[PDB]
Ligand binder design. Structure first.
Ligand SMILES: Nc1nc2c(ncn2[C@@H]2O[C@H](COP(=O)(O)OP(=O)(O)NP(=O)(O)O)[C@@H](O)[C@H]2O)c(=O)[nH]1
Lengths: 901, 300
């Protein structure tokens, strides 16, 4: 606990570190060479008599920690703060814990930044990312095409100035995000045309009757794609700005059109933020392991006024109660003479409201003049009333770049009043004694009992985008639609909840419920382990705290023999009913057996090796009959009642025992993720990339995710096979976890990825969102489901046509790009769904043609020379639409090549 | 103490409204009859483990009572819920009117526990008799006795009466525990030896953390049934009062005109009280006989 400082003469910064009770200075240390070139250049040899030995209780009241390239749920942030109670720090240290890593930054005491210092239990740490997931909603109106002072279009100010500055700062601070850039706007009087009916909406006012037809358009630009070297989006946004007025005016319904309505009179603003929340509520569906923070930024040329319905504003207050992610910035400039974020109510004195949940920021342009006016002008030809907006004073608002380049995660400790009485008339206590066991079965019992993951309380998710017509503007998405119904419910009338979850030894967790804030109180696995894990799982969702030669590994060995199975596919006489000679003198030769050591397996062996042995010595494919005949004497598994195991092509993981535990109800918000195994052949994967140019059906395993010597945390997660055949088709592995730190599971996945590529074939994480509409349990509100028609021009049409469709698909197989029927796991199996081998492309088979979508989960890692380089995907689009709409004579020559057999 | 850590299973079911989870919450969380007004609605299933004098641990299931939850019990996952059941408790409201649906659920529950438990047992418990006059309390309890003895025909049931504002609750769950206990005869023999060689009026031994009447021996049979209930209620009221003082009890002494009662720790989770048939003795007898008792029970 001793603290050692060591400057030299008049070093204006200092340095200090820890040890345990240094007095006589016999012992010194070298641990770091970097800190010399990180602070000051000198070579201190053993005792120059400058090393001060002092207790010096000097704290560092707020310290910032930045993350990169990973995924960290907030329980792991709690574990880092629990491990960072009583230590030292300095600027740009790389703090690590259990494969988790952060870089220290901007450490302050109350006015000033310190080079070094000490952290003890009462200073506060705040987590930020440079690897966040960020949406950019550009709101367009008729004020984009309007000039301002200094001489500009507001569009040109916004895009050119602000986006050039933001992308230069994104290059300078060396961050790597995942963006959307979505344009959105409204039009009026687009009533009806030929079958454009569920796209419109109709606005009205109660107190003075006013009802009009209107219509909302979203045009997306790049959807889910990280790349360095930006500013190409600036060129595409200029192209879409010039193409935009015809693109919005002359579409689906043509009455007299009024485009791009004013923001200070109407707007789809609050609906746009609510649809960003409709994206972010389903974060647990397809989980990237390379992003942490969440961010939604709306760029508007508005003044700050919005004329907004009452129900949507109250509903988005209740939805930003959960996960605060919203940021607003105004590229109009001209900071007005009142409290600038404000809402005039539009309910079905002009009723004002001011938000304190939003983070607004203006963008002044770069010039210097005399008196910047705060007013526009346009010449026509010819009981309470307790918030007004005008007596609130407001000097200037900046841009707040630090909350736009490094997004801040949600805090850990907040102070609030206790759970007394009156309104919240409901408490419930569950005291759950825990029996330690050495056989994964203890957390989930308490978990499904005491909460059922907000089984008590509701999720207030009342906005459902049920419809979306899309438009055949190009190969990004383009949904242009109506929001659909809003099924709002009020909060829990006359009672909130609070809970008392006890460990009957000595421990209590007191849960409050208006936002999930906790109070933990103290008085095989240990007691504190299960207690800490349960506090982490209450922490994950809403987590405020009150305060004051076989290497026989059970996946690697079977994965390696399924690698051996292609290259071996692609003794005396038989007919003796004694069977003792062959089936007992297998070990006389060099037959490899799992018999040296492994748990629950004295003398074991794999079926495929034995059947390849019996085809290497006896006849071809009648070996399973004699294998059953010897299985009637010598077995493999526990309670057999079977054939010769499975004779061929069937995966089994480890845990030999499964026959003679709480499951996962899908209400509990499982974090799941579908990795995928795709049989591949490089001989066409290279030239189309290059200059050339034209037994059940699921299986559960509950495995332990650790290759270390930890002895601190037991760590389990559930694999589901879809495959128990793996003929030469697709294969997929689902991972369901409500459990331990994701980064260890990420290095397990990447470990058998390295075992997949070297000596084998591709394992790729694959978006298990099929071609799903919005308001499905999978999917986004921003997916196109692109269409590609088969212009043919040449008893049971559909079945033979489906087989011919498989033939065209596997013809793209043979020449460039193999296919696989990715037989997914919904019962009755509605649509046929093909994955392409070694690429980024989904197809389904429903006009006459068949539809297409673009995988967004590769993201430049899990990357080899087989796949990659998105130009490949666009080339396959071009080649496939050429081959599909009957270019030169390709389909007709394919007809002749089929008919000549 | 030989720690044969078994794991017993007990369900608590019945109709919603009156006193489903309230009685469990006042018998295993140190509440009062007034503060149980704040529990409110439960959900489908919630359960708990409670440890109890060491070795025995109860999986205590509390089942809800809405229409969809009982239907999702019977015509659904039933085989998981009614498997390996030892003790069933079935709650009866007095004031409730829909008796037909109550006995309909009761018939279906009896047939389901018959087809999923051969040697379990059912205790039905008519609670909340604090609203009816005492002569009508006698009439209603005897009618429930006879009617439930008829409708519980192929397998027997035990029907008790209770309320929350009295001590018959403590008697009824004392009966549940004394049926559910593993061992009887060795503790009875040590009880009888202790009481007949240290000549007491009556000796009483209890669990510590909830104080249910485990065992007793007397030689003055002039208190009818309500001595155990009353003394358990009043000293657990005193323990609830001392709970707000950050202090444990573990020891007390009282003597009177013809009366000499003493309470102390015996073992890791057991209380003893005793009245000793000789009121004019100071604590030397209590000293030598807590010595005389802890030489034997700490060989047990
Ligand atoms: N005064 C009084 N109140 C009682 C008595 N019995 C039950 N209550 C009241 O009945 C209320 C309901 O508690 P309880 O029935 O345990 O709740 P529950 O049925 O498990 N909730 P759910 O309907 O979701 O299953 C309690 O608040 C309690 O005050 C009684 O004998 N006297």
């Amino acid at each position: 606990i001793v603290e050692i400082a060591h400057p030299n003469d008049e070093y204006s910064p200092l340095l200090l570190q820890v040890k345990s009770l240094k007095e006589d200075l016999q012992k010194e240390t070298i641990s770091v060479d970097q800190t010399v070139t990180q602070v000051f250049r000198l070579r201190p040899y053993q005792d120059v008599y400058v090393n001060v030995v002092d207790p010096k209780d000097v704290t560092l009241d707020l310290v910032e920690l930045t993350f990169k390239d990973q995924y960290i749920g907030r329980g792991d942030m709690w574990r880092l703060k629990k491990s960072l109670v009583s230590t030292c720090a300095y600027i740009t240290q790389k703090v690590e814990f259990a494969g988790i890593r952060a870089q220290a930054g901007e450490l302050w005491v109350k006015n000033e930044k310190v080079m070094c210092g000490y952290i003890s239990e009462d200073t506060r740490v705040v987590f930020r990312s440079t690897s966040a997931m960020v949406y950019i909603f550009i709101q367009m109106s008729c004020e984009m095409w309007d000039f301002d002072i200094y001489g500009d279009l507001y569009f040109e100010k916004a895009v050119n100035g602000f986006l050039a500055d933001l992308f230069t700062k994104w290059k300078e601070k060396n961050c790597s995000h995942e963006v959307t850039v979505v344009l959105f706007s409204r039009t009026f009087y687009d009533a009806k045309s030929v079958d454009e009916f569920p796209e419109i909406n109709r606005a009205s006012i109660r107190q003075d009757h006013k009802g009009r037809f209107y219509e909302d358009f979203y045009k997306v630009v790049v959807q889910n794609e990280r790349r360095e070297e930006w500013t190409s989006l600036l060129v595409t946004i200029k192209k879409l700005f010039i193409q935009y007025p015809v693109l919005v005016r002359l579409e689906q319904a043509e009455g007299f059109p009024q485009g791009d309505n004013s923001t200070s009179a109407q707007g789809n603003y609050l609906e746009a933020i609510n649809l960003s929340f409709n994206v972010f509520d389903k974060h647990y569906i397809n989980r990237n392991f390379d992003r942490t923070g969440q961010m939604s930024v709306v760029i508007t040329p508005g003044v700050g006024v919005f004329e907004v319905d009452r129900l949507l504003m109250i509903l988005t207050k209740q939805r930003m109660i959960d996960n605060g992610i919203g940021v607003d910035l105004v590229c109009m400039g001209e900071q007005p003479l009142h409290a600038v974020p404000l809402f005039k109510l539009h309910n079905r004195g002009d009723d004002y409201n001011i938000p304190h949940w939003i983070n607004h920021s203006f963008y002044t342009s770069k010039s210097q003049l005399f008196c910047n006016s705060f007013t526009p002008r346009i010449k026509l030809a010819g009981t309470l009333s307790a918030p007004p907006v005008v007596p609130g004073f407001c000097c200037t608002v900046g841009v707040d770049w630090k909350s736009l380049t490094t997004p801040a995660c949600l805090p850990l400790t907040t102070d609030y009043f206790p759970d007394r009485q009156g309104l919240q008339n409901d408490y419930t206590e569950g005291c759950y004694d825990l029996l330690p066991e050495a056989d994964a079965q203890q957390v989930f019992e308490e978990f499904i009992c005491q909460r059922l993951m907000q089984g008590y309380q509701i999720i207030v998710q009342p906005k459902t985008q049920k419809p979306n017509p899309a438009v055949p503007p190009p190969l990004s998405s383009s949904p242009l639609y109506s929001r659909g119904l809003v099924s709002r419910n009020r909060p829990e009338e006359e009672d909130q909840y609070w809970l008392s979850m006890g460990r009957t030894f000595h421990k209590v967790t007191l849960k409050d419920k208006m936002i999930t804030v906790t109070r933990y109180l103290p008085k095989p696995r240990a007691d504190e382990d299960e207690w800490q894990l349960l506090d982490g799982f209450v922490r994950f969702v809403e987590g405020l705290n009150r305060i004051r030669m076989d290497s026989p590994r059970k996946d690697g060995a079977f994965f390696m023999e399924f690698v051996r199975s292609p290259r071996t596919a692609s003794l005396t006489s038989s007919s003796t009913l004694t069977e003792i000679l062959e089936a007992m003198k297998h070990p006389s030769t060099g037959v490899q057996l799992l018999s040296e050591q492994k748990g629950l397996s004295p003398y074991c062996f794999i079926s495929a090796e034995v059947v390849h042995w019996l085809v290497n010595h006896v006849e071809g494919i009648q070996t399973q009959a004699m294998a059953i005949d010897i299985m009637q004497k010598m077995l493999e598994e526990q309670l057999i009642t079977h054939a010769s195991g499975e004779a061929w092509r069937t995966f089994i993981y480890g845990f030999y025992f499964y026959k003679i535990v709480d499951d996962f109800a899908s209400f509990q918000r499982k974090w799941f993720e579908v990795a995928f195994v795709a049989e591949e052949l490089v001989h066409s994967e290279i030239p189309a990339f290059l200059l050339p140019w034209l037994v059940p059906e699921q299986r559960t395993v509950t495995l332990d995710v650790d290759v270390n010597n930890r002895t601190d945390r037991l760590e389990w997660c559930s694999c589901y096979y879809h495959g128990n055949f793996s003929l030469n088709a697709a294969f997929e592995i689902k991972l369901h976890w409500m459990a331990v730190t994701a980064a260890v599971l990420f290095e397990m996945v990447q470990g058998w990825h390295r075992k997949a590529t070297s000596c084998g074939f591709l394992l790729v994480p694959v978006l298990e969102g099929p071609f799903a509409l919005p308001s499905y349990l999978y999917g986004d509100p921003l997916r196109a489901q692109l269409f590609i028609p088969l212009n043919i021009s040449c008893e049971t049409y559909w079945d033979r046509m489906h087989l011919f469709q498989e033939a065209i698909a596997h013809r793209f197989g043979f020449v460039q790009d193999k296919y696989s029927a990715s037989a997914f796991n919904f019962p009755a199996e509605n649509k046929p769904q093909y994955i392409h081998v070694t690429g980024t492309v989904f197809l389904q088979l429903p006009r006459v043609g068949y539809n297409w979508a673009y995988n967004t989960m590769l993201t430049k890692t899990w990357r080899s020379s087989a796949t990659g380089d998105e130009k490949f995907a666009d080339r396959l689009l071009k080649d496939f639409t050429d081959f599909c709409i009957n270019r030169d004579n390709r389909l007709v020559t394919f007809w002749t090549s089929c008919l000549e057999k | 103490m030989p720690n044969t850590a078994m794991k017993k299973k007990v369900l608590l079911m019945g109709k919603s409204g009156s006193g489903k989870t309230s009685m469990r919450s006042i018998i295993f969380a140190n509440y009062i009859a007034r503060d149980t007004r704040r529990l409110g609605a439960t959900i489908d299933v919630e359960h708990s483990h409670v440890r109890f004098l060491g070795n025995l641990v109860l999986n205590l299931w509390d089942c809800g009572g809405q229409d969809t939850f009982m239907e999702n019990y019977f015509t659904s996952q039933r085989d998981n819920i009614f498997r390996n059941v030892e003790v069933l408790i079935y709650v009866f409201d007095v004031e409730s009117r829909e008796l037909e649906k109550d006995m309909h659920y009761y018939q279906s529950c009896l047939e389901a526990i018959l087809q999923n438990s051969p040697d379990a047992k059912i205790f039905c418990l008519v609670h909340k008799m604090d609203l009816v006059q005492e002569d009508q309390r006698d009439l209603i309890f005897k009618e429930r006795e006879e009617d439930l003895r008829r409708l519980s025909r192929p397998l027997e049931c035990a029907c008790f009466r209770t309320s929350i504002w009295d001590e018959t609750l403590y008697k009824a769950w004392s009966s549940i525990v004394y049926q559910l206990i593993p061992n009887v005869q060795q503790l009875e023999m040590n009880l009888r030896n202790f009481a007949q060689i240290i000549e007491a009026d009556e000796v009483l031994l209890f669990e510590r953390a909830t104080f249910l009447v485990i065992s007793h021996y007397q030689c003055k049979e002039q208190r009818d049934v309500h001595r155990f209930e009353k003394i358990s209620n009043i000293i657990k009221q005193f323990k609830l009062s001392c709970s707000k003082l950050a202090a444990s009890f573990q020891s007390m002494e009282v003597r009177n005109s013809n009366f000499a009662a003493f309470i102390d720790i015996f073992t890791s989770n057991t209380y003893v009280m005793v009245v000793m048939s000789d009121p004019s003795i100071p604590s030397a007898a209590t000293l030598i006989n807590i010595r005389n008792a802890r030489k034997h029970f700490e060989k047990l």
